Write a protein that binds this ligand. Structure first.
Ligand code: KNW
Ligand code: CLR
Ligand code: OLC
Ligand code: OLA
Ligand code: OLA
Ligand code: OLA
Ligand code: OLA
Ligand code: OLA
Ligand code: OLA
Ligand code: OLA
Ligand code: OLA
Ligand code: OLA
Ligand code: OLA
Ligand code: OLA
Ligand code: OLA
Ligand code: OLA
Ligand code: OLA
Length: 360
């Protein structure tokens, strides 16, 4: 079949690229995750678990590459061949679940009604164990054609596919869709409220900026304090305190100095606004990247995988569908080197921590 020549030319290249990009990205990421960072949240745990899984899977891609460079011949043993499948599917579904967990955690962080480090490790251990246990029949106590689909494997894999498709791909993707919905909702409502607070404060600052006497400045500062009342919370409302100082000046009759005080109070409020809007932005970013990962890496692969299993026959080549499966399989594997784009653009000050970790 034509697809066999295609795979022999295609997989060595893509796998070894994924290996090179993935060892670099994950080793660097893991190094950053293991270095001490004071304000490190449970996010750090989930990313780290993902990174480690991704790296363990990447350590197998040379062997796969080897298989195809030899003309689809597995020279390693039966056990290494079983480990190929075991690593591939454990890493796949572990990754999907850590990513789902990371989006959920990041949503909870914006809403905050926390995941501690120890709890994050327990949740990770449970994910590891459930998925390793679900996968052990890939390790059953032919092999020359290690990575192929054959007629003895097809009956088991049809049943295995049903369950892995539903529970390991569609259920987490559904969870991600709900997460996106919830994050958009929270972000829009919170940003509407932040606009209203900013605008009330700016109204009163404009009033104070052109006020006739000290009583008027005092009244508008009082209204400002009423607006300031109602996750760092601006160092326990630092702006609200500075306003109290300005109100003292007002009650002393110092109009010019109270106006001067009010006019630098414009910026300390948007400091608060941003300290609590950056978490909402982190969650939006996490969910958008993760959904792109699903649409690129996992959903086409599970679709075509299912159709391939369903329509498979030992005599027929099925070249277009099989080639589409091969390319989507490559994208499922490439996820292991994609995941640091998440770490970098949606980690916890990851660019800062990288700069600090590499500087001599
Ligand atoms: O190269 C090529 O020509 C193309 C690929 C050939 N090829 C090679 C073959 C191969 O591997 O050798 O695989 C296929 C499959 N495999 C599956 O359809 C499957 C379905 C399920 C499955 O489950 C593993 C354990 C999952 C445990 C789990 C985790 C969860 F998170 C939730 C539930 C569960 Cl149960 C493994 C494979 C389907 C179609 C083709 C092949
Ligand atoms: C991944 C895919 C399926 C995402 C689904 C897209 C649609 C169905 C989602 C994405 C954003 C969602 C909206 C987000 C915000 C709100 C405000 C809320 O007070 C009413 C529901 C409403 C209007 C949601 C409706 C459903 C919604 C439009
Ligand atoms: C040939 C086979 C190749 C295999 C390649 C080896 C893969 C393992 C690499 C790094 C492990 C990192 C160990 C991570 C330990 C995490 C626990 C921890 O130390 O805590 C983390 C953080 O500091 C507080 O939560
Ligand atoms: C980016 C990496 C893309 C690699 C694809 C190589 C295709 C080789 C082929 O089709 O023969
Ligand atoms: C930056 C590292 C990323 C590595 C990504 C590897 C995944 C490759 C996925 C898609 C590439 C598609 C190439 C298709 C070539 C078709 C050739 C042909 O039709 O004969
Ligand atoms: C140590 C792993 C050996 C296998 C090679 C894999 C690539 C290296 C990946 C991560 C190396 C991290 C180095 C150890 C950091 C210890 C934590 C610390 O520095 O405090
Ligand atoms: C690590 C080595 C990277 C290149 C792997 C080549 C595997 C092979 O011999 O085909
Ligand atoms: C994930 C790639 C395939 C590896 C098979 C199972 C790996 C389990 C090893 C280490 C889990 C680390 C726990 C932290
Ligand atoms: C398969 C090969 C095995 C891979 C080995 C990777 C496991 C390494 C470290 C696992 C970390 C477990 C530490 C628990 C965290 C302790 C804590 O709660 O602070
Ligand atoms: C096997 C599971 C290994 C994965 C994570 C280990 C963390 C266990 C929690 C210790 C506290
Ligand atoms: C999120 C909710 C997920 C709902 C899933 C319900 C049904 C999905 C069934 C997928 C069908 C796979 C067919 C595989 C086969 O026929 O062997
Ligand atoms: C969002 C996640 C839910 C997505 C899809 C629901 C399940 C769709 C599966 C259709 C199954 C067709 C069949 O019965 O064979
Ligand atoms: C498919 C999952 C099974 C149905 C469970 C119901 C999920 C619907 C809404 C959950 C939203 C929770 C956010 C608060
Ligand atoms: C919200 C940010 C947009 C979502 C990401 C879109 C495309 C993927 C590119 C990832 C890098 C952009 C992230 C920008 C950022 O850090 O806010
Ligand atoms: C979002 C990005 C989606 C891109 C996925 C990449 C390749 C999938 C191509 C699927 C083609 C299916 C129709 C061809 C066929 O199999 O007959
Ligand atoms: C087929 C579509 C090709 C997409 C390949 C790489 C894009 C994602 C890289 C991150
Ligand atoms: C060799 C086996 C594969 C190792 C690949 C690991 C790649 C990057 C690991 C990161 C090491 C970072 C240490 C930098 C020194 C420093 O702290 O300044």
């Amino acid at each position: 079949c034509t697809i066999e020549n295609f795979k022999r030319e295609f997989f060595p290249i893509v796998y070894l690229i994924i290996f090179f990009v993935g060892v670099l990205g994950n080793g660097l990421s893991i190094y950053v995750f293991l270095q001490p960072y004071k304000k490190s949240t449970s996010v750090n745990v989930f990313m780290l678990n993902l990174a480690i899984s991704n790296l363990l899977f990447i350590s197998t891609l040379p062997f796969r590459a080897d298989y195809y460079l030899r003309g689809s011949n597995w020279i390693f043993g039966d056990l290494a061949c079983r480990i190929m499948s075991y690593s591939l599917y454990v890493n796949m579904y572990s990754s999907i679940y850590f990513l789902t967990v990371l989006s959920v955690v990041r949503y909870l962080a914006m809403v905050h009604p926390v995941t501690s480090i120890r709890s994050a490790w327990i949740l990770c251990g449970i994910i590891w164990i459930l998925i390793m246990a679900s996968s052990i029949m890939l390790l059953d106590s032919s092999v020359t054609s290690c990575l192929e689909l054959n007629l003895y494997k097809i009956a088991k894999l049809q049943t295995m596919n049903y369950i892995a498709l539903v529970v390991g791909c569609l259920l987490p993707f559904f969870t991600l869709s709900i997460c996106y919905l919830l994050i958009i909702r929270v972000l829009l409502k919170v940003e509407a409220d932040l606009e209203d607070n900013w605008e009330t404060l700016n109204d009163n600052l404009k009033v104070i900026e052109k006020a006739d006497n000290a009583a008027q400045v005092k009244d508008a500062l009082t209204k400002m304090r009423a607006a300031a009342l109602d996750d760092f919370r601006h160092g326990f409302d630092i702006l609200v305190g500075q306003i109290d100082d300005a109100l003292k000046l007002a009650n002393e009759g110092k109009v010019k100095e109270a106006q001067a005080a009010a006019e630098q109070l414009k910026t300390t409020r948007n400091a608060y606004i941003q300290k609590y809007l950056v978490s909402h932005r982190k969650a939006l970013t996490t969910i958008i990247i993760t959904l792109i990962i699903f649409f690129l890496c996992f959903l086409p692969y599970h679709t075509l995988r299912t159709v391939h299993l369903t329509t498979w026959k030992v005599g027929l080549c099925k070249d277009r569908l099989h080639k589409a499966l091969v390319i989507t399989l490559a994208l499922a594997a490439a996820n292991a080197c994609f995941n640091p784009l998440l770490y970098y653009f949606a980690g916890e000050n990851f660019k800062d921590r990288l700069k600090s970790a590499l500087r001599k």
